[PDB]
Structures are given as structure tokens and as C-alpha cells.
Write a protein that binds this ligand. Structure first.
Ligand SMILES: Nc1ncnc2c1ncn2[C@@H]1O[C@H](COP(=O)(O)OP(=O)(O)OP(=O)(O)O)[C@@H](O)[C@H]1O
Ligand SMILES: Nc1ncnc2c1ncn2[C@@H]1O[C@H](COP(=O)(O)OP(=O)(O)OP(=O)(O)O)[C@@H](O)[C@H]1O
Ligand SMILES: [Mg+2]
Ligand SMILES: [Mg+2]
Lengths: 226, 227
């Protein structure tokens, strides 16, 4: 056994891909084996491909997924439109357990939010964390409203004994602003803020990105993921 | 007393005020005496004033505030920035209890989402609904990301045994996109969708807003809120 984390987001478009990328790239630069799994990818019509973005930005080659739906909806909504069931709960859990091995950091990127249907029937990213005993990394904004959403997600995590590996602000703006600045200290007061990626990091080339990612996360913390 | 409903949102800016004004208007039309209560108001130096807008739109006069903070920030931070404290619990709860009276529908509008801090320490709108025995009407969007936001909110409500009075889509676009329609349909499977206010309802005048309101809601449901 190794270390699986689910990476989940408080909202639409908070930067969870760039955070998996970032944490993958920081953890690869610590000589850890890293695999990112995206069981369900939606929004392929407009061209989403989060595993690819983790490949380009972070250089991970163990990139595992199971289904791809064109529509930019929540998984079940993009499958109900498509006419094709979500993966079975069994496929998601065994894909992740097969990736997982001693010494490997395994990131598991949700589709949408923590409590949306990820596999048939009605089984969510939170269930999947329970089934594989993964902790949850929560991606958050700094913008107004983040506090409510973040408390809501930690409550939903604790309610099923899914540990919270911490928060990551997916976009730290420049210059902050009073709200961004206030929310960041407040978020640090209810959970540990593992990192706050600079805005626009999702366009750095592979090398610039890797230096940012190495600067974003705590050295010992990454290493301690093991 | 009467019937107290807190009206909380899944997010910032989903339409809590318009929904409070619309349900008040529909309830006033049914012959139900209505009070609208905004215990904690932020953004007053931006002109924010949810109680005023509720009068502007639904002609309610039994309005009741308590705390007002200049900054458009969360109540805790707007207070700090203004060298002020948040109100106390029983200051907020006394405000609502005073309003509660048999035959009256008392609407309590939160400040942001359900778990935003309203009073010190960590006192939320949910803790307040528990104390005044209130149910929660939840205002949502149809944009993607709503199902998670609505599921997180219902879970938080159930965790303290606060009954969900239903959902209200605060803004609903005509015509509706494929994401919107799909989300609405799925929202209805999570809970009862009491209403879906047409986009731009806040710009309506007294007359149109009242008619929009009477047709936005099921008259039998609105009737049944107050025994
Ligand atoms: N005002 C805005 N400024 C910047 N980006 C915006 C804005 N409005 C919408 N977006 C979009 O939000 C998206 C950023 O979210 P991102 O793709 O990082 O989501 P995620 O949570 O990491 O992953 P996924 O969506 O794949 O689950 C971008 O496509 C961006 O263009
Ligand atoms: N420049 C702005 N001025 C006023 N409101 C703004 C502005 N920018 C964004 N908003 C948001 O749009 C929301 C829409 O008003 P409305 O009151 O109907 O929504 P709400 O869900 O009730 O939010 P609130 O609890 O803050 O009143 C405002 O609450 C506010 O959060
Ligand atoms: Mg992704
Ligand atoms: Mg309001």
C-alpha cells in the first residue's frame, strides 16, 4: 500500500486540475512515484482533458481514466444526456487500488464536487475515498463565499470520517484585495493551507511550472505524503 | 408563535433577497401576515440593503434589521474591518422571537451561505434555525456546480435536524439551456423545487413583481405554511 489522495473542489472551476498537476510536479521532484487518476472526464466536447494537462504540466505518465463524456455537465448529467451509464462503483475502486502501491502518491481527481454521483448507482467521490481509505485534498477559491463552501465540504468529509489532507487555493490573485487577503487567513484558521498557486499558473510551460510548483508546497509536507 | 423560515443560499448572490420578496408577496396575497428579518447586513457602504429592496419589490413594511457593516465582506471580516463585533446569539434570536406570532410567516434572510458566521463564536444561521425551531428554504442556481452545493447544504441542514422547506431557483433563464434544464430536473429529484423566479424579477415594478410572485409559487404550498 501507498498514499492515495482524492483531490476535490469546492466549486466549478476552482483549479483542481492545476492543483493535481502542481502537487504531482512537486512530489515528482521529491523522487516520489506519482499517478493521477480521473475516472470520469466530462466536457470533452469543448476540449477538456485534465489528465493531459497533468501530463504536460507535471510530466506524469501514469494517467488513468475510465470514461469521457462530451457535455460540460456533472457526470450523471452528461451520461444521462449521452445515453450511457457511468462506470460501475467497482471499476473506479479497482482502478485506484491497482494504481496504488508502496511509495506511490496517487491523486484521484473528481468530476465536479465531492457529493455528486461519480459511479452508478449514486456513489460519489466521498464514497470512493471511504472505499480506498484516501484522505481528501480540498481545492478552494479566495473569493467571497469560499468560507461557507469550505466549511460545508469539511463537514461532509468529517461526516464520513474522510480525513482532510488540507486546502489549496487554486488561484491566488495579484494584487490580492481585502477579501482574498482576509479569506486566506480565515481559511488557515479552519484547516492547513498547504499552498496557494499563483493565478495564471495554468499556462506556464513545463519548466516554469515545475519551479512554481516546487515553491508552492512545503518540502517536508510533500515528502511526508510518501 | 407562527411559522419561521430561514432563507439561506448555496452561494453568494443566488437571489435570497428576491426570493424573500417574492415569497412574502405571494404570502401577503394569500392573506398571510408577513415579517422579513435580516439580522446581519454587510456591504452597506456599497448601498447594500436587502430589507429596503424587499420593500421596494414586495411592499412589505414589517422589516427588522440588527447589524450593519460597511464592507462587502463576510460578516466576520466586515465587522473586524469596521472595528465592530458581531451581534450575540440571543440578540439575533430575540429579534426573531419578538417577530414570531401565530398566523404570521416570519422570513429570516441569512448573510451568504448556511455556514457563514453570524454571531460570536462560530454561530451560524443553522444554529439559529435550531433555536427558533425554523425550517430552511434553500435558494439555488441552475448553473453547473449547483448539485454539489445543494447537496452539501442539505447535508448540513440534516446534520442538525433542520427540515428543508424546499428549493427556489433564484434566477431562471428563458429559454433554458441544456445544462440549466438538466440541473433543474436533477434538483427536483433532490428536493421539492418550490419555485424558479424568472431572470430579471428584481427589475420588475410593484405590479409585475406581485403577479410574478403569485404564479412563481404553488398557492396550496404557500397557504399551508401558516396554520
Ligand atoms: N471570469 C473568469 N476568469 C477566469 N476564468 C474563468 C472565468 N469564468 C469562467 N472561467 C473558467 O473556469 C475554468 C477554470 O477551472 P478549472 O478548469 O481549473 O476547473 P477544475 O475544478 O480544476 O477542473 P474540472 O473543471 O476539470 O473539474 C477555466 O476554463 C476558465 O476559463
Ligand atoms: N457590485 C455589486 N453590488 C451589489 N451586489 C453584488 C455586486 N456584485 C455582486 N453582487 C452579489 O449579487 C447578489 C444579488 O443580490 P440578491 O440579494 O438577490 O442575492 P442574495 O443571494 O440575496 O445575496 P445577499 O445575501 O448578499 O443579499 C448580492 O447579494 C451580491 O452578493
Ligand atoms: Mg480535471
Ligand atoms: Mg440578499
Amino acid at each position: 500500500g501507498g498514499t492515495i489522495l482524492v483531490v476535490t473542489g469546492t466549486g466549478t472551476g476552482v483549479g483542481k486540475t492545476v492543483v493535481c498537476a502542481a502537487l504531482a510536479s512537486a512530489a515528482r521532484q521529491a523522487g516520489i512515484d506519482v499517478a493521477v487518476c480521473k475516472p470520469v472526464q466530462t466536457g470533452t466536447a469543448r476540449g477538456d482533458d485534465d489528465l493531459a494537462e497533468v501530463g504536460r504540466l507535471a510530466g506524469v505518465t501514469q494517467l488513468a481514466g475510465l470514461a469521457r463524456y462530451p457535455q460540460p455537465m456533472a457526470p450523471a448529467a452528461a451520461a444521462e444526456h449521452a445515453g450511457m451509464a457511468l462506470p460501475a462503483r467497482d471499476q473506479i475502486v479497482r482502478l485506484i487500488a491497482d494504481l496504488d502501491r508502496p511509495g506511490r502518491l496517487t491523486l484521484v481527481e473528481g468530476a465536479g464536487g465531492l457529493l455528486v454521483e461519480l459511479a452508478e448507482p449514486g456513489v460519489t467521490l466521498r464514497d470512493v475515498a471511504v472505499d480506498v481509505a484516501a484522505a481528501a485534498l480540498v481545492v478552494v477559491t479566495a473569493d467571497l463565499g469560499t468560507l461557507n463552501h469550505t466549511k460545508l465540504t469539511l463537514e461532509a468529509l468529517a461526516a464520513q470520517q474522510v480525513s482532510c489532507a488540507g486546502l489549496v487555493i487554486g488561484s491566488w490573485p495579484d494584487p490580492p484585495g481585502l477579501v482574498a487577503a482576509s479569506n486566506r487567513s480565515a481559511l488557515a484558521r479552519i484547516a492547513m493551507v498547504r499552498a496557494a498557486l499563483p493565478a495564471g499558473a495554468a499556462s506556464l510551460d513545463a519548466g516554469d511550472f515545475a519551479a512554481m510548483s516546487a515553491a508552492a508546497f512545503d518540502r517536508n509536507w510533500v515528502a511526508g505524503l510518501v
